[PDB]
Amino acid sequence: PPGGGEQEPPPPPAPQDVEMKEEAATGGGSTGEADGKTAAAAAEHSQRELDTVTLEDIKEHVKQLEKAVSGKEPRFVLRALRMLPSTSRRLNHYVLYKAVQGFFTSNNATRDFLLPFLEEPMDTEADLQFRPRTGKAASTPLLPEVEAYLQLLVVIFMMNSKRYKEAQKISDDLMQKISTQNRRALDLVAAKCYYYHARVYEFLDKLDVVRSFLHARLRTATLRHDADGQATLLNLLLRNYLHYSLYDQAEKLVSKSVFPEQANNNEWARYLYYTGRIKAIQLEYSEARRTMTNALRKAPQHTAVGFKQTVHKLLIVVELLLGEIPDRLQFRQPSLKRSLMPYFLLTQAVRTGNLAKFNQVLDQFGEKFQADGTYTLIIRLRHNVIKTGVRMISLSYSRISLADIAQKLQLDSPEDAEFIVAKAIRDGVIEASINHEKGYVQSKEMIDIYSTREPQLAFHQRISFCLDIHNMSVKAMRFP
Amino acid sequence: PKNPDLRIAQLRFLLSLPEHRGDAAVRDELMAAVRDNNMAPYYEALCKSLDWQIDVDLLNKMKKANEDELKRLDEELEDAEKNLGESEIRDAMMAKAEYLCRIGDKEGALTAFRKTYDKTVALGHRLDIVFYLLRIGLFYMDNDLITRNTEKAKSLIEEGGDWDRRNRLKVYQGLYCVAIRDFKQAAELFLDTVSTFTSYELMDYKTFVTYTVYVSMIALERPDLREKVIKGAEILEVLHSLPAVRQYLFSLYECRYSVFFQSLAVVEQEMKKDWLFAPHYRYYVREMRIHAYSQLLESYRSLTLGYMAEAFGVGVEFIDQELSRFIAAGRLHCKIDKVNEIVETNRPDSKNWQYQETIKKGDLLLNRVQKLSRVINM
């Protein structure tokens, strides 16, 4: 008891400092950044806010409860106040409440007091200049609080932050005018709590009412604030719309646009994983392997944790349907390994041309196939076994009888033996010629050609268009 | 001061991988445990191998008496430093504590290595230290510390010059290149052959002869192979003593394929029971397939398999499934025809592969620059 009682005081001071000065220096600094320059945007505290939010998402967040200085909620949410020279007095009032909190119990517990608190900014009337400061002062307690998952009486409080964000959405439909240099930070912050829309709604069932609401927000941002807005909202669309049918494959067709410019960073890569599974549902394997590889290869630096391992998991699925895959056991991480353990023997069965080896993988690992969600291609891969199996033996064997190859091709009668190779040439597999009497399959090859034209002529536009973009970057980054 | 414990580490490999030896491996382990008075090594061996019965007071009084031999040295260091004689003090405590660390783990070892690092003015004692990191790295199969001691020693050795100990290091780096997969550097650094003679750090000289003659058949060219074994004057006798590998050498040049898999069976059986050769045999075998079949097909562009089947015993339908299944694996790709009786070699791949490295390397090259291009800025 004395140890646990005296170890309570040490923890709070760290949130009492960094959690106090995180939105004070970044948010209060963004106030001066939003007064001037305006360049145009930047607003580097918006990306610094991303660093602080992602910092809280690990440790320590805020609430929950923690029983440490719950008076931080009324601190920033009250006392604009009101015009800038009067706000300076309230900038001293934060220090006044620092002394009040340094004297008495400092209101270490709020809970049901969030009802007057969250409505106090509406009692001030008003900030009135910066809506992102009002939305952030209310959300910063509540957004990390969603990670508690208590599911009692505070879920509707998260919904109240969603209503405050809807007031942020109506103001996202009006002012402008003109260059709402704060709406990019509103795109950032709202995309977060739009994913908190996803989490809080997923506590019970699908959000479908918010699918029409997301389409209302996604379409009302057109065309003005779509920049960096439409990208995050399209992932908010694509993610759960990939979980719930339907039509998103043809919906993103008419939705594009592209939509440029890609922001922010890994956002477009993960979008190419989301739409990567989409474009993989059309089964064209050149665009699917390029969108899946570009999804993972374009994503630094992690941690955390396993979904960046999931894009790598589903990445080589289209490579399994290509007919040739390397053994990936050397790419296993300490985490991704234990997650894909069935998928290991799966791609090992894809390398081999044995049917029973692949079918036993299906019967045993079908439970993990339910966990991943990819099924339909597991039964049709038997056609990849007959095409890779015939690619194997044909190129392999000098002249193979249709009765001897019939074991690995499982039928290979005297009739279909013609089509196996012939319709493989239709798919561009093997050139083997067969004169059918008994018969026997005599595989030869003569090709000397290509390896030339498209690679070098494309490399011209590749390199040139690249260095042109690198011009568009460097030439435009010299403002300082 | 190595081979007794080197055999213990070899006995660890004899216990670990094969599960079918329950008698001789533990017997001679105890025969080597009752000597050198090992403590920490028999703890790891106690968990892997049998838990006895009882050790307890036996090796505890042996570690108590060795502690008296440990405490007579560790209480002599303050009595020796009472006098002054530069080395006439610390050289006794650096070598004997490494013998006291030979009793267990890395502790006295690493702490004496950096201890004496600031004292010895001669490279011979520094290389003896290097020998201690190499033996303790060989027992625990740790390749991290065997690179650093040699990298620091060679600068002092190559400043520089040596005869014997330079050939010793060539055997070391040859054992490290063969510990991981390096085919060329093993035989190239073992080209010294008999000039190393026999040493306690080189263990059995016949085993070293088998190490260089087993690794010289892969990455070395066929004219260079017979130039090493046949033209080599000193290496020819020591490889002649064992007919097992010598039969594989002269029959590989004789091109006869009827003795190959039997001679390779004896070679592979020796490859299985030797340490550090376990990961490398899987590629080593199929490499000997494409090695012997490279001179099989190169005889004639269009070859009649009837002439192949003349003396095989029997190669009529065997080379069909044999070579084919090796072609499907990726070893010696060729297009062969039957009932036309044409084995066509080929395929030079002088067109696709000639220009393929451009687009191939350029794929991942331009990919890796596409990452760094589209990541920044934003």
Partner: peptide, 24 residues
């Protein structure tokens, strides 16, 4: 990051090759 997506969630062969001789 921690932002965006990720926080959501013929043998060798020895015996058989030696046996091919004495098989036939």
């Amino acid at each position: 990051m921690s932002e965006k997506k990720q926080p959501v969630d013929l043998r060798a062969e020895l015996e058989k090759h030696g046996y091919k001789m004495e098989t036939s």
